[PDB]
Amino acid sequence: LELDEQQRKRLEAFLTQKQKVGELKDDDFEKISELGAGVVFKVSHKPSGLVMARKLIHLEIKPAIRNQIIRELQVLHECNSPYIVGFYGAFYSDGEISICMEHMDGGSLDQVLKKAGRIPEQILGKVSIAVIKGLTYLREKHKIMHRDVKPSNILVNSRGEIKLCDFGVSGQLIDSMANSFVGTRSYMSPERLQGTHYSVQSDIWSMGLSLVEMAVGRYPIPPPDAKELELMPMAIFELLDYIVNEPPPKLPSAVFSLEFQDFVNKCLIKNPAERADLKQLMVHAFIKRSDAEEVDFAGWLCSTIGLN
């Protein structure tokens, strides 16, 4: 599975630190500051002095399905790879499902993008490698798909790692909660919007659309104006109808390499059958390039936002 030694040594170190904490409840944590909402908080755990990230979601529903949600979610103990954020535990408390996760020093790429303005191609190659490896790991080891890929769910650290969060493990939580939200933006594939059977192909599209937003600093659809590109108020249905009935986004031909331009073009093919799968994407020229490249990711991240 191309498991590196330094990765496998940092995977063991957190699995043995995973039993030092053991189980937890609600009084073991203490707040620090506001991470964001879509809520998650920076948290101090008191039994084990490790600082963790606790995301809270408010669900008042019949307790029979709350128990089915928690037992489906405990499978995250089996999901462990260098490209998925560290999972601590899941429990119901005060009618608020709380997920305790690794704290990521750099936050989400959505935060990173707003502070960085734009994200260079050299480094978008590294996150793309991490996502396909993380998505192959998820589809192969547990036979699930992500269903919610977007920059605000890609997390980075000053340690130099890349890992994704908020992936769909519980089918009941999907039918009961996650489906009811609709944001001002949509990262959903065109075949999911038309309600066909979608696979990880739908996740490829999300990755492609996310890459375009990070590369240009703007949510891609509707495509920017001709002069707006040089510098760098819509209802939700006009957004969704554009994704289905209009050409997909593409990177500007003047700034980025063919390997990058073609990479996103293969990710953003509307038909998922012709869209690139993960096998085809792992061997794509843009991946072979950045995988063999030499970037110091920790240096860019800490000098972009001001960490150490």
């Binding site: 879509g38 009811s180 949509s186 959903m188 038309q194 209802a235 939700i236 249905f237 289905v244």
Partner: protein
Amino acid sequence: VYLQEWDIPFEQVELGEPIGQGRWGRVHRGRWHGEVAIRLLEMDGHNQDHLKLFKKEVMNYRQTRHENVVLFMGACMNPPHLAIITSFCKGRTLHSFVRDPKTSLDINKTRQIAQEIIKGMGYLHAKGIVHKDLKSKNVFYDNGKVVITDFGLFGISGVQLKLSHDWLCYLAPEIVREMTPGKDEDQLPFSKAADVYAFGTVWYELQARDWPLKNQAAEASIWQIGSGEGMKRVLTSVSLGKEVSEILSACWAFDLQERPSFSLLMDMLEKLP
């Protein structure tokens, strides 16, 4: 409104156990002697224009009485606290009724239930009242008789986006295209035509005992509903009967103006098996 302004003589009403929640306050069982349903709302707007239109609507519901519309009894507004009191419906919501294994739906029972609902929607429309929230959860079935609940209630302005799937199925394309974050439900284009579309979905429920769209993401449903392609597909995907499907295709008409009136729909339901 001090409740003494109503023709239902009032000395005292008592709150009882709550019976489920929703976007529109908390509904309590209660006793007027008869059991009643009491809905407790709160006006965050607190603005005189909200209450003037509220006073307009509740005084209009005072004029309503029909065997297929729930009896509106009184409303009292001690702002920001408001309360709406309707007759309590014994029996099961039509939603939970069709989804029962034990329930025995048939080509006749569905026609009879639907004609009842059309009569109630006919009356409400005759009085110029748009229901704005016709769905299976707001229709009650006790033995023979069928009652419509929760009509006109969306015209109220009380205290990202979250949209239930069950509600989306009953929403006409005119409405879901206008949905957007920061836009309140009071600004959506409900209408008599949007009401007959919601009758299309409730008729589908009478035939299929389930939603016309399986529990998808909201975004997925929003496009399918608003494009009219969603209802096109489910119309073809599984058929029940040419005569039965004719009224379903008519009610779900993409152009609202091509949707029948309720008085017309009474005749269509008559020329059936």
